[PDB]
Amino acid sequence: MNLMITLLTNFTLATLLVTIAFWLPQLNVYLPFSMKFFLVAITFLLFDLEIALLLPLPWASQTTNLNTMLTMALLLIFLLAVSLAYEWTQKGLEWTE
Amino acid sequence: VKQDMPPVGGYGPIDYKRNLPRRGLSGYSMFAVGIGALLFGYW
Amino acid sequence: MFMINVLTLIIPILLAVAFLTLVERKVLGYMQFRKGPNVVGPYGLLQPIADAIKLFIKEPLRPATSSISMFILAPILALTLALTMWIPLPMPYPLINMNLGVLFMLAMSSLAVYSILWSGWASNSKYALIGALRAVAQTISYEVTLAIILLSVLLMNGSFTLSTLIITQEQVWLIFPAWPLAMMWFISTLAETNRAPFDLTEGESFNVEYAAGPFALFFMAEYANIIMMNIFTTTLFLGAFHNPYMPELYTINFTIKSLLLSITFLWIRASYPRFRYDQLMHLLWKNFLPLTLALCMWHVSLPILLSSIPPQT
Ligand SMILES: CCCCCCCCCCCCCCCCCC(=O)OC[C@H](COP(=O)([O-])OCC[N+](C)(C)C)OC(=O)CCCCCCCCCCCCCCCCC
Ligand SMILES: CCCCCCCCCCCCCCCCCC(=O)OC[C@H](COP(=O)(O)OCCN)OC(=O)CCCCCCCCCCCCCCCCC
Ligand SMILES: CCCCCCCCCCC1=C(C)C(=O)C(OC)=C(OC)C1=O
C-alpha cells in the first residue's frame, strides 16, 4: 500500500516534470538489418533465462539435500558456460565480441 | 653588446629520455596480497 | 506522514543530482589542471540553478516524431524508474522495507532500457535508432554480469533483503571475500549508466531529438542512476557500522563512501579513453562473463565447503 503510494508519487512527479518541460517553453513565441545486434539480443535472452534458473540459489543453499543441490547448481552454471563456449567457438561473439 | 646569448659555462643538462619509474609490487606479491584478502574475507 | 518520508527521499535525490553536475565539472576541472565553474555562484554553487533555468526556457527543438506517445513516455519511464530504484535502499532503514529488494532493484534496472529504445524509435533519425540499439545491446549485455555477480554475493547474504546486507558485513566488508566480484561489479555498473569509458552515446565511432527540458530529464535520471548504483555498491561491498540507537552514524558513513565512489566515477571519466563498441562487447562476453561464471560456481561451492552458509531469515 505504501509501495503503491510511492510508485504513484514517483510517476506523478515524473509526469509533472515532463509536462513542465514540454509546455513551459511554449510560452515564448520564438536502417539495414544487422544480424549481429539481433544475435547479441537473443544471446542475452537465452542467458537471461539461464540466470532465471540460477536466481533461487541463496534459498537453495538452505536445503538438507546439499550434495544434490550443489551438483545441480554447478551443472546449471556449467551449462551456461557451455552455452558461452559454443557461442565463442562457432564465431557467434564476433565483431561485437 | 646587447645580444641574447647562452652563459659562459652553458646551460645545464636537459632531461629528454623516457622516465617511467617502475613502481608497484611484483606479480607474485600482488596475487599473494589478493589471495590473502580473499582468505581473510572467507575466514 | 509517509508522504513526508517519500518527499524527503525524492526531493533530496533531485538536489543531489543537481549538485553532482557541479561536483563533476569542478573535479574534472581540477584533474585537468584548471578550475571548474567558480563565477556564477560563490565557489560556483549557483551554476546548476542557472543551467536549469537556462534549459527550462530554451526553445523546443520541435521534432516531427514517429510516435508522440513513446516520445513522452521515455522520459517519464526513465525518471520514474530512476526514482523507484531508491525506495528499498537501506540507509540504515529503507523507505520500503521489502524482502526481495535486491531482485526488485535488478528488475527495475532491467526495465530502464525501454526509455533508450522508445526514445530511439520515437526519433525520426535512423542513426539515432542505430545508436539506441547499440546502447540497449550494451546495457542488456552488462545486466548479465550484474545479475550473476549480485547472485554470487548474495550467496553470502542468505536472502534478497537489502537490510540483511548490513548484518552480513558487521565483522568485515564484503569487498574482502569478494573483491573480484566487486571490481567486475563496479565496471559493470559503469557500463550500465553509459558512463565513460563506456559512453558511446558521446563518441563519434540516442536522445538528440528531445528539447533542452526533456534532455535535462534524461540527464537527471542518468545521474540519479549513477548516485544510486554507487549507493547500492556501497551497501553491497562496503557495508558500514550500524548502531540501532544512533542510525545517523550509518547514514554519515554510507554517505561518505557513496560520495567517494561517485567521485571515483568522475576520476575514471577523466583518466581513460573510450572503448570501441566491439571492445566492450569483448570485455563483457569474453572477459567478465567467464570469470563471473567461475566465481559464481566458487561462491556456490564455498559456503558449503567452509560450513559458512548464511541464514535465510
Ligand atoms: C567496488 C569498489 C571498487 C572496486 C574496484 C574498482 C576500482 C578500480 C578501477 C580501475 C579503473 C577501471 C576503468 C575501466 C577499465 C575497464 C577495463 C578492464 O578493467 O578490463 C578488465 C580486464 C580485461 O582484460 P584485457 O582486455 O585488458 O586483457 C586482454 C585480454 N585478452 C587476453 C582476452 C585479449 O581484466 C579482466 O577482465 C579481469 C577482471 C578481474 C579479475 C580478478 C581475478 C581475481 C584473481 C583470480 C585468481 C588468479 C590466480 C590464478 C588462479 C589461482 C587459484 C587459487
Ligand atoms: C507505460 C506505462 C507507465 C510506465 C511508467 C510507470 C511504471 C514503471 C515504473 C513502476 C514499476 C512498478 C512495479 C510494481 C511492482 C514491483 C514489484 C514489487 O512490488 O516488489 C516489492 C515487494 C516484494 O517484496 P516483499 O517484501 O516480498 O513484499 C512484502 C511482503 N512482506 O512487493 C510488495 O511490496 C507488494 C505490494 C503490493 C502489490 C503492489 C502492486 C503494484 C501495482 C501493480 C503494478 C503497477 C504498474 C503496472 C505497469 C508498470 C509498467 C510495466
Ligand atoms: C527542476 C530540478 C532540476 C531539473 C534538471 C535541470 C538541472 C540538471 C541538469 C542540467 C545540466 C547541467 C547542470 C550540466 O552541467 C550539464 O552539463 C554537463 C548538462 O548538460 C549535459 C545539464 O543538462
Swiss-Prot record, chain A:
Source species of the chain: Ovis aries
GO cellular component term, pick one: respiratory chain complex I
Record protein name field: NADH-ubiquinone oxidoreductase chain 3
UniProt keyword Magnesium present: no
One example of a Gene Ontology biological process annotation: mitochondrial electron transport, NADH to ubiquinone
GO MF term list: NADH dehydrogenase (ubiquinone) activity
Record's function text: Core subunit of the mitochondrial membrane respiratory chain NADH dehydrogenase (Complex I) which catalyzes electron transfer from NADH through the respiratory chain, using ubiquinone as an electron acceptor. Essential for the catalytic activity of complex I.
Reactions accelerated catalytically: a ubiquinone + NADH + 5 H(+)(in) = a ubiquinol + NAD(+) + 4 H(+)(out)
Cross-referenced Pfam families: Oxidored_q4
Subunit composition and interactions: Core subunit of respiratory chain NADH dehydrogenase (Complex I) which is composed of 45 different subunits. Interacts with TMEM186. Interacts with TMEM242.
InterPro entries, sorted: NADH_UbQ/plastoQ_OxRdtase_su3, NDAH_ubi_oxred_su3_sf
Keywords: Electron transport, Membrane, Mitochondrion, Mitochondrion inner membrane, NAD, Respiratory chain, Translocase, Transmembrane, Transmembrane helix, Transport, Ubiquinone
Membrane topology: Multi-pass membrane protein
Lineage, opening ranks: Eukaryota, Metazoa, Chordata, Craniata, Vertebrata
EC number annotated for this UniProt entry: 7.1.1.2
Keyword set includes rRNA processing: no
Transmembrane segments: 3-23, 37-57, 66-86
Family: Belongs to the complex I subunit 3 family.
Gene3D superfamilies: NADH:ubiquinone/plastoquinone oxidoreductase, chain 3
Compartment list: Mitochondrion inner membrane
From Swiss-Prot, chain C:
GO molecular function, one term: NADH dehydrogenase (ubiquinone) activity
Transmembrane feature ranges: 2-22, 68-88, 100-120, 147-167, 172-192, 212-232, 248-268, 289-309
GO biological process terms on file: mitochondrial electron transport, NADH to ubiquinone; mitochondrial respiratory chain complex I assembly
Keywords (A to Z) from UniProt: Electron transport, Membrane, Mitochondrion, Mitochondrion inner membrane, NAD, Respiratory chain, Translocase, Transmembrane, Transmembrane helix, Transport, Ubiquinone
Entry EC number(s): 7.1.1.2
Paired cysteines (S-S): none
Purpose of the protein: Core subunit of the mitochondrial membrane respiratory chain NADH dehydrogenase (Complex I) that is believed to belong to the minimal assembly required for catalysis. Complex I functions in the transfer of electrons from NADH to the respiratory chain. The immediate electron acceptor for the enzyme is believed to be ubiquinone.
HAMAP family: NDH1_NuoH
UniProt name for this protein: NADH-ubiquinone oxidoreductase chain 1
